[PDB]
Ligand SMILES: [Co+2]
């Protein structure tokens with residue numbers, strides 16, 4: 001469970017950034033996205 | 049505001065990982081922390 005709990009925060013975050021980038025086009029914002037994507041994979045991985 | 053909204057998700061996340069690492073000592077988990085820390089700084093920065 002704890003890990004699934006990280007999973008959902010991570011997915012809720014990648015939504016807020018996703019929306020933010022739907023309007024303002026900042027590179028830094030989008031650099032954060034790819035950090036969470038990398039993240040998200042590592043989560044499911046060890047989730048199994 | 050939107051940016052402050054990212055700020056709080058990011059800070060709430062670094063709490064869940066912080067706690068998780070308070071019990072299980074996975075390197076990957078801690079690699080995520082430092083991604084969010086890097087993140088957090090970029091947020092406040094552009095927050096001003
Ligand atoms: Co919308």
Ligand SMILES: [Co+2]
Pocket residue numbers: 010035036039080083084
């Ligand atoms: Co993340």
Ligand SMILES: [Co+2]
Pocket residue numbers: 067
């Ligand atoms: Co506690």
Ligand SMILES: [Co+2]
Pocket residue numbers: 032035036058083084087
């Ligand atoms: Co982050």
